[PDB]
Amino acid sequence: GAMNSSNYAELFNNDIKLFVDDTNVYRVTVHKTFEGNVATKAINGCIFTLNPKTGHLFLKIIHTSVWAGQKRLSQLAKWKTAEEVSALVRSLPKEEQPKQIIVTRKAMLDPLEVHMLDFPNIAIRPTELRLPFSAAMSIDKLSDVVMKATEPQMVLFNIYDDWLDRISSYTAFSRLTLLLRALKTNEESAKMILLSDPTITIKSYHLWPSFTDEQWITIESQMRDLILTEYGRKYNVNISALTQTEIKDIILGQ
């Protein structure tokens, strides 16, 4: 059924699976009209479809043209997500098709199930994990390709860069979720931590900086402090008072 803390290792086994996050598919700016009413203006969006074992990211860019002359866009967005995920699965060779698709939002279950009726052996699952994939659009290179798109486009990335050369998928996913949780809680602060030291660059073919193993430890520490600093700033909680069990719990807590 539902993917949770108890069945977390399952993400890194040899059964092909994808996470689908639809939180950046339908994006708007809300504004005043000349007559003082309120209107929305859509901007480009994206489906975030990720293989957590390999880091393979299928970024389907959702161009604003998709929404032209359509009604109930927040409902349509779920169905368009399910349509594009279904199209992606059918585009993959049989041996590359996922055995499970985990949706980050329960509202995606019926739309995806109905689009995947032809694939009765692909399991469509919710998760109890609170995954910070909404913060994908805080990754500069992903934000750039989405905002520049003039038509529907699929762009393929590895969200782990070359990390799997040195670390396991479990550790790579933990690093990604910590980075995205930090970007989601305080984007300014997270970007400062990642990009302050100008000697450490981002390779042309990478998303994140080229940190040594020791520098990743320092970065990861700075991210955990930020999430705690912000969790302190939020709830008015002396964070200098907290123990290491107290601290451990709140990051996973969120």
Q: Is 68 in the site for ligand USP (CB under 6 A)?
A: no
Q: Is 139 in the site for ligand USP (CB under 6 A)?
A: no
Q: Is 158 in the site for ligand USP (CB under 6 A)?
A: yes
Q: Say how far apart CA 120 and CA 129 lie, in whole Å.
A: 25
Which ranges in the chain belong to alpha helices (H)?
A: 73-91, 109-115, 140-148, 169-185, 187-195, 213-235, 244-253
Q: Return the DSSP state at 65.
A: G
Q: What is the CA radius of gyration of the chain?
A: 19
Q: Is 165 in the site for other proteins (CB under 8 A)?
A: no
Q: Could you say which residues in the range 102-131 bind other proteins, by CB under 8 A? A: 110-111, 113-115, 117-118
Size of residue set near other proteins by CB under 8 A: 12
Q: Return the DSSP state at 126.
A: -
79, interface contact from ligand USP, other proteins, none, CB < 5-8 Å by kind? other proteins
118, interface contact from ligand USP, other proteins, none, CB < 5-8 Å by kind? other proteins
Give 165 or 188: the residue with its C-beta nearer to ligand USP.
165
What number of other Cβ atoms are within 10 A of residue 202's Cβ? 15
Q: Return the DSSP state at 168.
A: -
Q: Is 92 in the site for other proteins (CB under 8 A)?
A: no
In contact, 50 and 18? CB cutoff 8 Å: yes
In the complex, the residues that contact other proteins under the rule CB under 8 A are: 75-76, 79, 82-83, 110-111, 113-115, 117-118
In the complex, the residues that contact ligand USP under the rule CB under 6 A are: 56-58, 156-158
